[PDB]
Amino acid sequence: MGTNQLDICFLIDSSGSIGIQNFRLVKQFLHTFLMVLPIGPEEVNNAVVTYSTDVHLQWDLQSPNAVDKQLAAHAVLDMPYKKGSTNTSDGLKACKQILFTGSRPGREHVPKLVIGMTDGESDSDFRTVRAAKEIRELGGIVTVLAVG
Amino acid sequence: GTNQLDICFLIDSSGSIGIQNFRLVKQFLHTFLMVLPIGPEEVNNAVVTYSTDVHLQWDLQSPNAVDKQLAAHAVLDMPYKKGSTNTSDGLKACKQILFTGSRPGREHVPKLVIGMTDGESDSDFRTVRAAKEIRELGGIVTVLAVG
Numbered sequence: 647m648g649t650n651q652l653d654i655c656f657l658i659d660s661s662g663s664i665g666i667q668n669f670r671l672v673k674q675f676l677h678t679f680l681m682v683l684p685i686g687p688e689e690v691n692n693a694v695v696t697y698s699t700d701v702h703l704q705w706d707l708q709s710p711n712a713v714d715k716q717l718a719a720h721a722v723l724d725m726p727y728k729k730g731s732t733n734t735s736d737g738l739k740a741c742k743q744i745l746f747t748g749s750r751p752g753r754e755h756v757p758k759l760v761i762g763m764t765d766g767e768s769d770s771d772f773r774t775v776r777a778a779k780e781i782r783e784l785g786g787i788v789t790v791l792a793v794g
Numbered sequence: 795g796t797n798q799l800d801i802c803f804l805i806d807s808s809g810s811i812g813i814q815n816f817r818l819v820k821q822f823l824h825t826f827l828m829v830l831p832i833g834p835e836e837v838n839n840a841v842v843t844y845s846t847d848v849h850l851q852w853d854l855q856s857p858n859a860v861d862k863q864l865a866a867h868a869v870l871d872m873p874y875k876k877g878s879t880n881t882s883d884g885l886k887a888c889k890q891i892l893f894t895g896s897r898p899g900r901e902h903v904p905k906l907v908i909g910m911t912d913g914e915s916d917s918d919f920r921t922v923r924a925a926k927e928i929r930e931l932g933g934i935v936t937v938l939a940v941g
Contacts, residue, residue: 647929647934648920648929649916649919649920649925649929649935649936649937650916650919650920650935650936650937652934652936675825675829678822682822682938682939682940683936683938684916684936684937684938684939690936757904757934772796772797773795773796773797778796782795782796787799787904788796788797789796789797789799789830789831789837790796790797790831791829791830791831792829792831793829794829
């Protein structure tokens with residue numbers, strides 16, 4: 647395991663709970679976070695999934711966006727707001743599939759992180775649902791950021 | 795559990811960076827602290843700054859480690875301290891904090907070093923012994939280029 651090596655699945659609430667204005671803030675924050683991360687083929691790989699009624703893969707770990715900071719940071723700004731129900735558990739299962747079956751070759755020693763991004767209001771599903779515990783059992787690290 | 799992490803923030807305060815860029819780092823760190831699920835049962839944080847010498851701001855035993863508002867306000871006040879770049883001793887300090895100085899019993903929880911620099915000087919974070927030792931303890935070392 648090297649310095650600056652992480653596979654991160656960002657799981658971004660785009661649901662009716664959140665509201666466009668808060669969702670725009672999230673995208674702003676995520677853009678800034680991606681700009682400061684050391685993103686690259688041998689360093690941080692990023693995937694981005696938004697969730698509401700269904701899950702919407704933006705890109706997985708095999709995407710060119712996953713290893714190019716300018717591609718990823720530009721792309722996150724234009725993710726559309728979806729406004730439906732809040733299917734956290736399926737969101738988490740989509741990250742779990744990307745992290746544990748979809749990483750790039752040579753990353754077995756690389757930590758697997760879910761970074762949730764929400765309100766802060768009703769994101770208890772992250773601490774609670776079976777899909778979160780499974781990722782942790784696989785050795786994944788699940789954290790939720792509340793951009794408010 | 796979800797949200798359970800020990801983070802040692804290691805902030806470059808060297809002359810290399812400048813007071814302008816130092817205040818920017820402090821502002822990015824304030825926001826980053828505000829969004830993190832900091833609490834006694836969740837994310838615990840410690841902050842150390844470094845130039846020629848390492849300046850402990852707080853360890854994981856401090857009330858600032860478990861209180862989002864405490865930590866965020868304290869980071870803003872942190873003094874610029876022009877100097878050289880003692881990354882090795884910075885990382886030794888984070889190592890001591892993370893692996894001997896957690897609250898009970900967070901001995902099992904993920905341990906992270908998050909460095910904040912001016913986008914440059916991230917080579918030492920890869921190569922020095924202190925970094926390697928962290929990684930071999932299972933600690934995760936990631937440098938943010940706030941710049």
